[PDB]
Design a protein that fits this description.
Chains A, B: This is Phage major capsid protein, HK97 family. This is part of a larger assembly, with 2 copies of chain A. In chain A, 0% of the residues lie in helices and 30% in strands. By secondary structure, chain A is mostly beta strands. Chain A has strands at 2-5, 10-12, 25-27, 30-33. In chain A, the strands form 2 sheets. Chain A has a two-stranded antiparallel ribbon with strand order 1-4. Chain A has a two-stranded antiparallel ribbon with strand order 2-3. The first copy, chain A, contains no helices and 4 strands. Chain A binds chain B through residues 15-17, 19, and chain B through 12, 14, 16-17, 25.
Chain lengths: 47, 47
Amino acid sequence: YTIAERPDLRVLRDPFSAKPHVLFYASKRVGGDVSDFAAIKLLKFAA
Amino acid sequence: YTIAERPDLRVLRDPFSAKPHVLFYASKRVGGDVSDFAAIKLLKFAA
């Protein structure tokens, strides 16, 4: 499994949209799927 | 009578909320009621 990501947490406080509040907008971006299909085995329970 | 206040007026102007406008927002916070009921006497005009 290979995980790709940006190593931060972009926070943007928004005193404008919801006016008497602050509305912090934090967003980390991360992705990833299996890269080596031979390196993972599973246990299915059926038969 | 005790006045509790934050000795500043906080201003916030958002060109972003409604774009063609500015929407100045200015606020201060204050509060207070009586602290010594024995130090304020009134004059009712009834009896």
